[PDB]
């Protein structure tokens, strides 16, 4: 819903694992924003791969091929 893929406590866990000690509260929305952007990009690639194969279920190999693409730019 309004939680947009990741809870506030989970965002804080991710930041701590990133070495962060304090965040402005605006970081929550920004992290949710980034998450959505990243998934749209990755999922668009995974989806076309699934459909080009003529399947109805997205496989871990669909996601993997999609990740290799993201991996080479990033």
């Amino acid at each position: 819903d309004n939680i947009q893929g990741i809870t506030k406590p989970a965002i804080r866990r991710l930041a701590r694992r990133g070495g962060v000690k304090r965040i402005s509260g605006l970081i929550y929305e920004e992290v949710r924003n980034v998450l959505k952007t990243f998934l749209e990009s990755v999922i668009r690639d995974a989806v076309t791969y699934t459909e080009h194969a003529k399947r109805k279920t997205v496989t871990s190999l669909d996601v993997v091929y999609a990740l290799k693409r993201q991996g080479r730019t990033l």
Partner: protein, 68 residues
């Protein structure tokens, strides 16, 4: 990250491009989403550090973003 809201998001996002998801497929996405985010948070943290802050701001994240 918790599995259930992530999954709900994966589905909202797959829907704007139209499908079912294999469970390892969601897990791999989640593991990858987490690495990506943590990596961005490290860069954001370094920009704050260079500005002599330990508090990360929207502007820091926005810059680490623009350096795609």
């Amino acid at each position: 990250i918790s599995r259930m809201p992530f999954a709900r998001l994966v589905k909202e996002v797959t829907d704007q491009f139209t499908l079912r998801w294999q469970s390892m497929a969601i897990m791999a996405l989640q593991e990858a989403s987490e690495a990506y985010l943590v990596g961005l948070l490290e860069h954001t943290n370094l920009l704050a550090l260079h500005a002599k802050r330990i508090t990360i701001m929207r502007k820091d994240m926005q810059l680490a973003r623009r350096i795609r």
